[PDB]
Design an enzyme around this catalytic site. Structure first.
Site, PDB file in Angstrom:
ATOM      1  N   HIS A 118       0.763  -1.239   0.000  1.00 59.37           N
ATOM      2  CA  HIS A 118       0.000   0.000   0.000  1.00 59.37           C
ATOM      3  C   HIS A 118       0.800   1.299   0.000  1.00 59.37           C
ATOM      4  O   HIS A 118       0.199   2.364  -0.125  1.00 59.37           O
ATOM      5  CB  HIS A 118      -0.901   0.018   1.192  1.00 59.37           C
ATOM      6  N   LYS A 163       2.437  14.570   2.090  1.00 58.55           N
ATOM      7  CA  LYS A 163       1.126  15.023   1.654  1.00 58.55           C
ATOM      8  C   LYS A 163       1.134  16.547   1.459  1.00 58.55           C
ATOM      9  O   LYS A 163       0.202  17.153   0.932  1.00 58.55           O
ATOM     10  CB  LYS A 163       0.102  14.567   2.716  1.00 58.55           C
ATOM     11  N   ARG A 194      -4.091  12.574   6.763  1.00 61.29           N
ATOM     12  CA  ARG A 194      -3.156  12.584   7.886  1.00 61.29           C
ATOM     13  C   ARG A 194      -2.152  13.692   7.628  1.00 61.29           C
ATOM     14  O   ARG A 194      -1.812  13.919   6.472  1.00 61.29           O
ATOM     15  CB  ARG A 194      -2.405  11.222   7.991  1.00 61.29           C
ATOM     16  N   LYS A 215     -13.386  10.638  -2.997  1.00 64.59           N
ATOM     17  CA  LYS A 215     -14.632  10.983  -2.303  1.00 64.59           C
ATOM     18  C   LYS A 215     -15.043  12.396  -2.693  1.00 64.59           C
ATOM     19  O   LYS A 215     -16.238  12.643  -2.904  1.00 64.59           O
ATOM     20  CB  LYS A 215     -14.462  10.927  -0.787  1.00 64.59           C
ATOM     21  N   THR A 232      -7.567   8.093  -1.805  1.00 68.27           N
ATOM     22  CA  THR A 232      -8.900   7.512  -1.766  1.00 68.27           C
ATOM     23  C   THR A 232      -9.775   8.685  -1.327  1.00 68.27           C
ATOM     24  O   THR A 232     -10.940   8.803  -1.675  1.00 68.27           O
ATOM     25  CB  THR A 232      -8.708   6.317  -0.784  1.00 68.27           C
TER      26      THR A 232
HETATM   27  C1  LIG Z   1     -10.856   8.607   2.928  1.00 66.76           C
HETATM   28  C2  LIG Z   1     -10.265   8.873   4.303  1.00 66.76           C
HETATM   29  C3  LIG Z   1      -8.887   8.897   4.477  1.00 66.76           C
HETATM   30  C4  LIG Z   1      -7.908   8.839   3.282  1.00 66.76           C
HETATM   31  O1  LIG Z   1      -7.665  10.108   2.728  1.00 66.76           O
HETATM   32  P1  LIG Z   1      -6.474  10.347   1.682  1.00 66.76           P
HETATM   33  O2  LIG Z   1      -6.369  11.807   1.416  1.00 66.76           O
HETATM   34  O3  LIG Z   1      -6.489   9.440   0.523  1.00 66.76           O
HETATM   35  O4  LIG Z   1      -5.316   9.852   2.552  1.00 66.76           O
HETATM   36  C5  LIG Z   1      -8.380   9.127   5.715  1.00 66.76           C
HETATM   37  N1  LIG Z   1      -9.187   9.368   6.781  1.00 66.76           N
HETATM   38  C6  LIG Z   1     -10.515   9.402   6.628  1.00 66.76           C
HETATM   39  C7  LIG Z   1     -11.350   9.878   7.783  1.00 66.76           C
HETATM   40  C8  LIG Z   1     -11.081   9.140   5.397  1.00 66.76           C
HETATM   41  O5  LIG Z   1     -12.442   9.224   5.275  1.00 66.76           O
HETATM   42  O1  LIG Z   2      -4.146   1.689  -0.274  1.00 65.66           O
HETATM   43  C1  LIG Z   2      -4.812   2.412   0.776  1.00 65.66           C
HETATM   44  C2  LIG Z   2      -4.070   3.664   1.199  1.00 65.66           C
HETATM   45  C3  LIG Z   2      -3.498   4.449   0.018  1.00 65.66           C
HETATM   46  O2  LIG Z   2      -4.596   5.072  -0.653  1.00 65.66           O
HETATM   47  C4  LIG Z   2      -2.545   5.573   0.448  1.00 65.66           C
HETATM   48  O3  LIG Z   2      -2.209   6.337  -0.677  1.00 65.66           O
HETATM   49  C5  LIG Z   2      -1.288   5.025   1.112  1.00 65.66           C
HETATM   50  O4  LIG Z   2      -0.561   6.105   1.681  1.00 65.66           O
HETATM   51  C6  LIG Z   2      -1.719   3.904   2.103  1.00 65.66           C
HETATM   52  N1  LIG Z   2      -0.936   3.358   3.070  1.00 65.66           N
HETATM   53  N2  LIG Z   2      -1.715   2.473   3.703  1.00 65.66           N
HETATM   54  N3  LIG Z   2      -2.933   2.449   3.111  1.00 65.66           N
HETATM   55  N4  LIG Z   2      -2.992   3.364   2.082  1.00 65.66           N
END
Ligand SMILES: *Cc1c(COP(=O)(O)O)cnc(C)c1O
Ligand SMILES: OC[C@@H]1[C@@H](O)[C@H](O)[C@@H](O)c2nnnn21
Ligand SMILES: *Cc1c(COP(=O)(O)O)cnc(C)c1O
Ligand SMILES: OC[C@@H]1[C@@H](O)[C@H](O)[C@@H](O)c2nnnn21
Lengths: 823, 823
Positions: free
Chosen positions: B363, B560, B555, B666, B662
């Site tokens: 991941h 990021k 996070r 959204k 991810t």
């Molecule tokens: C979707 C989600 C994440 C992932 O966000 P990214 O910007 O892809 O890291 C993390 N925390 C919560 C609360 C989420 O709903």
């Molecule tokens: O694959 C699921 C998500 C990815 O979307 C993130 O980009 C990555 O930082 C990560 N590390 N652990 N899980 N994840």
């Protein structure tokens, strides 16, 4: 929102509904189904189905007490010996038949599921069972009462007998959960320990303390068919667990692995002595309970009715706290602490409130068994409470000085503070100075309190001292355990005796009715056949169910004299071997109880009864004129089986050691005749039935003291009595332990040399008294007319009389034998 | 028995029965009533009402997998970020309507009751939400799928911002219980630690081990309206009590106190790195889960028909285990132990069965995220497992030598054993060696895996390597959180899109419909008004609901680049300060996420974002053309509130550091334009929407490598760009922290001297892209028409697409969207 209502969620009287609710609980509450379900799941699905009829009345009772705002009574006991709630709930709610038809039509035997339930691991002897009989009687007489104590996770052990020895196995009666309790996370309180007192402005601030949390679980206790359900609230110890890295203090080493652990075993197991865990337990339950008592005084109309800083002038009119032995004695320095230190009341006002609120019950004798705590222990974990104790003491002894000027030895006998090699607080003294009534638990027990242990206190305040003879609830101990007998009684005189047990007096009109006589008799026969078989259904031997069942079931203790009974058992045996062709009334003598891990003699005594059984139960000559059975892991549910099967009730303590007894009254009620000394409530049972109707023997308390002053010499009994000479040598020579001859080394030397309970002294009168028993047994009609004469005269010993006396004489509330509409 | 069935226990879409059952749960389950019930009590009563209808379908879904024994798939993750179950269970079950009308007739507001539920403290970022989205997709596509994980008692903290700093408070989401989980005491399994190996006859025996109990909790997971309800089984660590007598180890001294505290805290809180406790969480979840998989493989069906000694031959066809990162990789040596040591199969048979069963998902990329364990740590607590990783390594290394004869650098490179200062087991090599499929999580991510981190392995088995771009579940992330947008999409195109998100391409025909265009903008404006008011219902400032809602929620981590967004907020602030009368599109920038306690640069960044908000939300000149807000305690239910309110989505990681993202998906589904780099899944999204429809800036991975290769000196950027130079010196001079001038020292020297993430290198291109965002926002029909182009083209990002590709291509099962029926 007025339709968010209780009113109709459970149509009572109904098999169809009960099968629907059984099935909703199996599939939704339990998340199981017939393919996966086990009899334990079945039992839980039924516990939840009866349970819904219970909490319906519970809701409505507490609603009632809220509108009504009566005086609430708080019963603190560090033991509640409840043992098994399913059948008790169904008969107090009239659900029995209905649950029975319903499970039948469902494919399940209600009796076999009843046997799945654990005896609640919350107590051990008669102190605990008494609190359980009293909570059933407070609900039936409609008092607004609460039981408060600890929720022990392991109770106290289950007794396994391995090779004649007691093995104590673990009891996790809570492995699968307990359907009756309701956790109350919302009400969690902190309890403080250690710290130090900073004497500021107004005064003291107990600062820098460790905290342990007290979470409450509630259990409902149903009254007999009046729809009032009261609450038993038990505290569980929970560590605050922000620590992983919290406050910031973190680093060092985790010496807060120890705080979680030591917090956690405040609840894990029950106890018998003076160790820091015992004091932490005692304070945990006092602190939480008193916080809850004040919370509830404050919400229900008195936070509103504050006048002057929510005043407690009315607290004694709305709260009564009953202190059971000195184990919750810290309630007196704790209530004085909340009131002075937290509510800012004057010492003089708070002391007034305290003593009108608290009352003390002493439950056992002989003047050293009562708690004394080293002042350095108290100084370390409860510093503010040694302070308040010292002031209570300073001030009580000035009262005593006022009353008895200038005689200085009584000031120091009366002191809460004892001096010597280690100064101590005598907690029984604390309990008297700070309670408005003190009581004993059987007329001769209360008298020896006034005349020995507490006579100084009695001379300062004669009025304080009362008597409230123990009782037994006739629901569990007649209706529930002996349904056959409760039926031939209701046929003759009606069912109102079940909560007015003096109505059993009406039975005396049937002493001569041949029809009652043969019923009384058939029920015992039927009860004995049932018991004779259970005793081989779980465990085994070969019981003649036509023998006189002779039974001694109580804790194993030298004061209780299971040893006097063993001497009489081996005498019968020597008798039969000497004359194998003599007619002898056959007997099954059954002995049961638990030693105490670490009570060495008591463990040794269990191995004697075992040993004796191995010899006499496999002796071809003896045949089945004698059987000796040690009934394993005695507890409330076993008491429920064996006490209706009994013919003779062994109640034989040395006169003066048994404060009341309560087992003695369950046997009188269930048709057994009693052989016993003039000790405890045996005195008052013999007076109600008539001495003619009781097999009294032995030394009276008058005679024990005489023996003490001449000096007890056991050799002079050995020397003048040959059958006793014969048992002792058989015990010395290895007759009963042939593989290991001097296994009974100890018993023989304690008997012969330093027996505090004078066994040999009462032996000859005992075996002659027993001889008279056998003669009456030989005559069925007469045996059974004295039995009627006993059952009819047992009403005085209902816990309902005991509690109406506490209500009117100590608590100042009126009993009510009246219906609540519900559900 | 027959009559102990789910019989007819609720009518579902019937208000009349839902009010009935509401009232039963408030009264009989919770033992409260209306006088006494709190807001939380009515929520728990609604939770149990809804739960009854979930478990009815659940029991029937598991009976059905038993009678059909399908290939079962186990999704193992050390995070499940579920966040709040009530509203997802009512819309997945088509019960929301009915419940809304039932709570409303009862006088309750269901929106307030939903707010009372705690997020399940079971996860943390993207690994956790991916696993929760996938459990909802596996269920909707009718797969026999089980999530397995650990139940944490306090998650990983709740964030509080105090004085502008993160403070972490403990989370006991479990204080009042959790109505969604079923404790299963009966199914406790033991997990072993420590010990040594006895190589006896058949072989090794793992003896003298420590035992921890693994108690499961089941939570139901419902598919969208097809009535399948799969299971989330979460393990809880129990200490074996016999902190009393067993082994008489103790019974004189306690230190067994440490085995209890340490056993039990396997379950207490979540983690990020390498220590013995992490490896104990990891082996714990792997051991307990694998006993259940085998148990259920034998018991459900194969313990009665089984063709050859109960055959594991068929095991790869009836079980699929998905390994998420290296956190579960001990499942490969644990499967082997159990099959070889306990079941006696041969290492070759059991290895054939092991690589066909397991598949691995990677991941995140830099070798840091690919755990390595010291063999000394492994030799001590998992001695048999170390014996098996060595045997696996040998055999593997023989295979690579067979394929690449003489390439020794390769052998030492591919080996699972890393030498150095401490020999280490590279756990990524174990999952690749023992898995039949390895996948990355976005097409550029899986390319770099085949290209850099795992190319040697790819060369040995190219066919193993794949891609499976992440998705998002359209139930939670559209229907549930954005009922307004889901409704205007269903007026035009119907509601099949909820389980076939590609149907949203149908909305491209409405790009020019003036009514659709104003509905899409009305919905957005209502979400903003609503969120503008939540923001000051709980928390407060003054948010102008007309401004552009610019949001970065993820996070806090240097890759990021929340710092890049800070550089722009201050550019904008500096601009307005030079021209207080120029026309500016007004913005609310909202940043939110949690640091990681112990990640110091990340708590400095949270403080910058807060300090920059103190300065600009109080600058009189600025008025309300810029506000900077930090969202405190970003978690799944806050992401449900802010993501529908957003206009601009910040997805600004350095190209090559975000594996997929991810959250990006959204925001696209809920009508927000994206400003982002060509990283992770931003690449495939831009491609679905057309590059013209995305605000793409900065460096591409090929560029980041160049820059690398010539060396990044941040001063040459500092030097040739004046707004930048001004920002840095304002950080430096203490303009944002006047009370502590060099508070942001660390940040400035990192930026100037060791920025691993090349912030200054994308800043110009970034502020320019932002100006384009601003130019377009001023044109409201063009902005909405580009939104329709992004919302209508978001279908590839449904987790239903992702899961059908795991199913077909890795697990060998076919999705089904056949409504299993009934009850
Ligand atoms: C979707 C989600 C994440 C992932 O966000 P990214 O910007 O892809 O890291 C993390 N925390 C919560 C609360 C989420 O709903
Ligand atoms: O694959 C699921 C998500 C990815 O979307 C993130 O980009 C990555 O930082 C990560 N590390 N652990 N899980 N994840
Ligand atoms: C009645 C009872 C007791 C008390 O019996 P005594 O002989 O008074 O000591 C103790 N244990 C149980 C199980 C009882 O039911
Ligand atoms: O009052 C209940 C019982 C008495 O009946 C016993 O005789 C006495 O030993 C005792 N000690 N604690 N509790 N009890």
């Amino acid at each position: 929102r007025k339709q968010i209502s209780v009113r109709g969620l459970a149509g009572v009287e109904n098999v169809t509904e009960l099968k629907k609710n059984f099935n909703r609980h199996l599939h939704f509450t339990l998340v199981k189904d017939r393919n996966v379900a086990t009899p334990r799941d079945y039992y839980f699905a039924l516990a939840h189905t009866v349970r819904d009829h219970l909490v319906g009345r519970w809701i409505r009772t507490q609603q009632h007490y809220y509108e009504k705002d009566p005086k609430r009574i708080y019963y603190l006991s560090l033991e509640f010996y409840m043992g098994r709630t399913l059948q008790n709930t169904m008969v107090n709610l009239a659900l029995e038949n209905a649950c029975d038809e319903a499970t039948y039509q469902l494919g399940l035997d209600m009796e076999e599921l009843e046997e799945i339930e654990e005896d609640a691991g919350l107590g051990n002897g008669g102190l605990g069972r008494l609190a359980a009989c009293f909570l059933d009687s407070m609900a039936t007489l409609g008092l607004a009462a609460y039981g408060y104590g600890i929720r022990y996770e392991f109770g106290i052990f289950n007794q396994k007998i391995c090779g004649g020895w007691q093995m104590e196995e673990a009891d996790d009666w809570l492995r699968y959960g307990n359907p009756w309790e309701k956790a109350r996370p919302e009400f969690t309180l902190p309890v403080h320990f250690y710290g130090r007192v900073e004497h500021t402005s107004q005064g003291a601030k107990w600062v820098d303390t460790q905290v342990v949390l007290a979470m409450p679980y509630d259990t409902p206790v149903p009254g007999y068919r009046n729809n009032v359900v009261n609450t038993m609230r038990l505290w569980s110890a929970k560590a605050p667990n922000d620590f992983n890295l919290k406050d910031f203090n973190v680093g060092g080493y985790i010496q807060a692995v120890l705080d979680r652990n030591l917090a956690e075993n405040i609840s894990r197991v029950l106890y018998p002595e003076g160790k820091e865990l015992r004091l932490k337990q005692e304070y945990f339950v006092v602190a939480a309970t008193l916080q809850d008592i004040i919370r509830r005084f404050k919400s229900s109309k008195f936070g509103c009715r504050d006048p002057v800083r929510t005043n407690f002038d009315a607290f004694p009119d709305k709260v009564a706290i009953q202190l059971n032995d000195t184990h919750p004695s810290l309630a007196i320095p704790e209530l004085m602490r909340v009131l002075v230190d937290l509510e800012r009341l004057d010492w003089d006002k708070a002391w007034e409130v305290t003593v009108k609120t608290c009352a003390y019950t002493n439950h056992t004798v002989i003047p050293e068994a009562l708690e004394r705590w080293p002042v350095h222990l108290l100084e370390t974990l409860l510093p503010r409470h040694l302070q308040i104790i010292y002031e209570i003491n300073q001030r009580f002894l000035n009262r005593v000085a006022a009353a008895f000027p200038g005689d200085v030895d009584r000031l120091r006998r009366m002191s809460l503070v004892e001096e010597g090699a280690v100064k101590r607080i005598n907690m029984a003294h604390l309990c008297i100075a700070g309670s408005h009534a003190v009581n004993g638990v059987a007329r001769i027990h209360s008298e020896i309190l006034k005349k020995t242990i507490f006579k100084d206190f009695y001379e300062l305040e004669p009025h304080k001292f009362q008597n409230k003879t123990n009782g037994i609830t006739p629901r569990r101990w007649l209706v529930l355990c002996n349904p056959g007998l409760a039926e031939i009684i209701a046929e003759r005189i009606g069912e109102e005796y079940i909560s007015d047990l003096d109505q059993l007096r009406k039975l005396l009109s049937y002493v001569d009715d041949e029809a009652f006589i043969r019923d009384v008799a058939k029920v015992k026969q039927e009860n004995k056949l049932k018991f004779a078989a259970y005793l081989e259904r779980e465990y085994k031997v070969h019981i003649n169910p036509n023998s006189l069942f002779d039974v001694q079931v109580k804790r194993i203790h030298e004061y209780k004299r299971q040893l006097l009974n063993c001497l009489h058992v081996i005498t019968l045996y020597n008798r039969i071997k000497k004359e194998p062709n003599k007619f002898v009334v056959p007997r099954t003598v059954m002995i049961g109880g638990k030693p105490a891990p670490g009570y060495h003699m008591a463990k040794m005594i269990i191995k004697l009864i075992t040993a004796i059984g191995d010899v006499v139960n496999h002796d071809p000559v003896v045949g089945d004129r004698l059987r000796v059975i040690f009934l394993e892991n005695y507890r409330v549910s076993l008491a429920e089986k064996v006490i209706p099967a009994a013919d003779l009730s062994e109640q034989i303590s040395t006169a003066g050691t048994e404060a009341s007894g309560t087992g003695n009254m369950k046997f009188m009620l269930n048709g057994a005749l009693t052989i016993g000394t003039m000790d405890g409530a045996n005195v008052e049972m013999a007076e109600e039935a008539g001495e003619e109707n009781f097999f009294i023997f032995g030394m009276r308390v008058e005679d024990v003291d005489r023996l003490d002053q001449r000096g007890y010499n056991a050799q002079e009994y050995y020397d003048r009595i040959p059958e006793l000479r014969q048992i002792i040598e058989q015990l010395s020579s290895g007759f009963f332990s042939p593989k290991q001859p001097d296994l009974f080394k100890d018993i023989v030397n304690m008997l012969m040399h330093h027996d505090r309970f004078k066994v040999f002294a009462d032996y000859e009168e005992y075996v002659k008294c027993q001889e008279r028993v056998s003669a009456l047994y030989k005559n069925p009609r007469e045996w059974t007319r004295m039995v009627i004469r006993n059952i009819a005269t047992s009403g005085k010993f209902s816990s309902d009389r005991t509690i109406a006396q506490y209500a009117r004489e100590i608590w100042g509330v009126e009993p009510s034998r009246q219906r609540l509409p519900a559900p």
